[PDB]
């Protein structure tokens, strides 16, 4: 059984379980009644993490460890925050903030410019549009979340648009910050090794500097509007591209300044990469000078 932490405990009758969000344990959408003591009468839409039917002892241990890690890291606007937990007299439920617009990759792709007669999906026409200032603002918010996590001594190890969630208010929130098959693909069929720093991939050295490399790939994802890094590149060819010092091309509609930022994040020497603190400062300055007119 689990011990009661009254800092986070929410009674079971206060959580109304809803539709599944996905399946790593399962996550469902829910409504929490009286999450805050003012008001005990207000419902808040939340995401709830719980274990699947065939859950092992280590699966439960990992869920507990992730919840424990979130309590220790504390609160920030640009991370998925812990809101509560149902630990007593039933299955463990970990309650976190809800991001109604899904992950950053989905959010960017759904807001791509309309489809033309040469496009894969010519019928694509979103009722939602992103200016150049909006894309730099996304990168600023993610850098801010990462700067906070780094100040808390947290190394993400899988920073990518898939692990950034977007709220109803377009706030970027870093996800899965408190959690190794190189050939294993994601839910969307992409290879996570494509976000890894060379020293993380070849020497298994994970630092804030290796997360900055990943953030460089995340920036390329923002400016390609959810583009796929190295499409058609298998793991062994990726390794060779990295050993050769190859770097991804400059996306179109991306300033020389922002491509230089990407390239700086991808410095071969980890110590020479900008820190998250420098990236937040450079991004804050760039946001203010970036046109929202297109
Ligand atoms: C239905 C609308 N749709 C829009 C396209 C989808 C909206 C999806 N929103 C949404 N919000 C908040 C969520 C929070 C966590 C979440 C993040 C955490 O980080 C710290 C920790 C956590 O537990 C401890 C849960 C989460 N983790 C998942 O593993 N999820 C799947 C299985 C879908 C990949 N998934 C969320 N998903």
Numbering used by the authors: 464 to 486, 489 to 644, 651 to 765
What does the publication say?
activation loop conformational energetics in FGFR1. function of FGFR1, as has been postulated for other kinases. crossed in the transition between DFG-in and DFG-out states. kinase suggests a high free-energy barrier for the DFG flip.
pathway models for the binding of PDA and ponatinib to FGFR1. were determined to be enthalpy driven and entropy driven, respectively. interaction between the t-butyl group of PDA and the P-loop. in the PDA-bound ensemble, while Phe642 was significantly protected. with either ligand-free or PDA-bound states. ponatinib complex compared with the unbound or PDA-bound kinase.
